[PDB]
Amino acid sequence: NQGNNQQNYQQYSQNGNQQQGNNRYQGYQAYNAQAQPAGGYYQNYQGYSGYQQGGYQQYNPKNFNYNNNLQGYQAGFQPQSQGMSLNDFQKQ
Amino acid sequence: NQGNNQQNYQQYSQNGNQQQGNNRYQGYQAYNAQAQPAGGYYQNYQGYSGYQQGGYQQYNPKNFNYNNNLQGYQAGFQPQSQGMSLNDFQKQ
Amino acid sequence: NQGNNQQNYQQYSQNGNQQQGNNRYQGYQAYNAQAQPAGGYYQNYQGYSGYQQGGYQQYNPKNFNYNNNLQGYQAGFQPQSQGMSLNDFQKQ
Amino acid sequence: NQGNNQQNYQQYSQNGNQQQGNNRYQGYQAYNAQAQPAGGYYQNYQGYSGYQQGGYQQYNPKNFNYNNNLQGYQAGFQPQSQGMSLNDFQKQ
Amino acid sequence: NQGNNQQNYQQYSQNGNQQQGNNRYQGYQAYNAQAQPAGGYYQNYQGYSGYQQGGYQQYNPKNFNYNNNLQGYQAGFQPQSQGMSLNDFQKQ
Numbered sequence: 001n002q003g004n005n006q007q008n009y010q011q012y013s014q015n016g017n018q019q020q021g022n023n024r025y026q027g028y029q030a031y032n033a034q035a036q037p038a039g040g041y042y043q044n045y046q047g048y049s050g051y052q053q054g055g056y057q058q059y060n061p062k063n064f065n066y067n068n069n070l071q072g073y074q075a076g077f078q079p080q081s082q083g084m085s086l087n088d089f090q091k092q
Numbered sequence: 093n094q095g096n097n098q099q100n101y102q103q104y105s106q107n108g109n110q111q112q113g114n115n116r117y118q119g120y121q122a123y124n125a126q127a128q129p130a131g132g133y134y135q136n137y138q139g140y141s142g143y144q145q146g147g148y149q150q151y152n153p154k155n156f157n158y159n160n161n162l163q164g165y166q167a168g169f170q171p172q173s174q175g176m177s178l179n180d181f182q183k184q
Numbered sequence: 185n186q187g188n189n190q191q192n193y194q195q196y197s198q199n200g201n202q203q204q205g206n207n208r209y210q211g212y213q214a215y216n217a218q219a220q221p222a223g224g225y226y227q228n229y230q231g232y233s234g235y236q237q238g239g240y241q242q243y244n245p246k247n248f249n250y251n252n253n254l255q256g257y258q259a260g261f262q263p264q265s266q267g268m269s270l271n272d273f274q275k276q
Numbered sequence: 277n278q279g280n281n282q283q284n285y286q287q288y289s290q291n292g293n294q295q296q297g298n299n300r301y302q303g304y305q306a307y308n309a310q311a312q313p314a315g316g317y318y319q320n321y322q323g324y325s326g327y328q329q330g331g332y333q334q335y336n337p338k339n340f341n342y343n344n345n346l347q348g349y350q351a352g353f354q355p356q357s358q359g360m361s362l363n364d365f366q367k368q
Numbered sequence: 369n370q371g372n373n374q375q376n377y378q379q380y381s382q383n384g385n386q387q388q389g390n391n392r393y394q395g396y397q398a399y400n401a402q403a404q405p406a407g408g409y410y411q412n413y414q415g416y417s418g419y420q421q422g423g424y425q426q427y428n429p430k431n432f433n434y435n436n437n438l439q440g441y442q443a444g445f446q447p448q449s450q451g452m453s454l455n456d457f458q459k460q
Contacts, residue, residue: 008100008144014136021112027119032127039131048140054147068145069164077169089181100236102194106228113204119211124219131223140232146239157249160237161256169261181273192328194286198320205296211303216311223315232324238331252329253348261353273365284376284420290412297388303395308403315407324416330423344421345440353445367459
């Protein structure tokens with residue numbers, strides 16, 4: 001093994017659990033607009049975990065732009081540009 | 093093994109669980125607009141996990157643009173451009 | 185093995201579980217517009233996991249644009265362009 | 277083995293489970309417009325998992341555009357263009 | 369083995385399960401417009417998994433456009449074009 005290496009390794013185990021019954025679950029989701037409502041009856045919850053964004057790795061024994069967007073909000077980007085740019089984010 | 097390497101390795105186990113019955117589940121989802129409502133009756137929940145975005149890896153013993161968008165919002169992008177650009181994000 | 189390598193390896197196991205019965209499931213989904221409502225009765229849930237987006241890998245012992253969009257929102261893109269561009273995102 | 281390599285390897289097992297009966301499932305889906313409603317009675321759910329988007333891999337011991345869109349929304353794209361472009365996303 | 373290689377390998381097993389009977393399934397789907405409603409009575413569900421989109425792979429020891437769209441929404445694309453383009457996405 002020699003050189004660059006980006007490794008994402010996640011080990012998750014949910015095995016050997018007992019959940020008893022007789023449960024009453026009433027879930028009301030209504031009139032949601034541009035939303036992601038989450039809910040429920042859980043015992044073991046593993047979620048939204050293990051995120052890896054790689055980076056610069058240069059191994060040696062013209063405009064470059066690299067953008068990694070994970071679950072993010074990016075608006076109004078003019079990198080390495082020539083001219084005039086107008087970005088208006090007025091909130092009233 | 094020699095050179096660049098991007099590896100996504102996820103191991104998940106849900107094996108050996110007991111869920112008892114006699115359960116009452118009433119789920120009401122209505123009048124959702126541009127939404128992703130999530131719910132339910134769960135015991136072991138593994139989700140939205142293990143995301144890997146690769147990066148720059150250069151191994152050596154003109155405009156370049158690389159964009160990785162995972163579950164993201166990207167609006168108004170003019171990288172490495174020449175001229176004039178108008179991006180208007182007014183909210184009233 | 186020598187050179188670039190992008191590998192997505194996911195191992196998932198749900199084997200050896202017991203789910204008891206006598207369950208009452210009432211699910212009401214109605215009047216959803218441009219929506220993806222999710223629900224149900226679950227014991228072991230593995231979903232929306234294991235996403236890999238490859239990256240730059242250059243092994244050596246004119247406009248280039250590379251865009252990877254996974255479950256994302258991309259609007260108003262003018263990379264490496266010459267001229268004038270108007271992108272209007274007014275919300276009233 | 278030598279050179280570029282993009283490999284998607286997913287192993288999923290649901291074998292050896294017991295689901296007891298006597299279940300009552302009432303599912304009501306109606307008046308959905310441009311929607312994908314999901315629901316049901318589940319024990320082991322594996323879905324929407326294991327997505328791989330390849331990337332740049334260059335092995336060496338004029339306008340290029342590469343776009344990978346997986347379950348994404350892309351509107352208003354004018355990469356590597358010359359002229360004037362108007363993209364209007366007004367919401368009222 | 370030498371050169372570029374894109375391989376999609378998925379192994380899924382659901383073998384050795386017991387599902388007991390005496391079940392009552394009432395499913396009502398009506399008045400859906402431009403929709404894909406999904407539901408039912410399940411034990412082992414494997415679906416919408418294992419998607420691979422290949423990428424750039426160049427092995428060496430004028431306008432090019434490559435677009436891969438999987439279950440995606442692409443509207444208003446004018447890459448590597450000369451002139452004027454109007455794309456109007458007004459929602460009222």
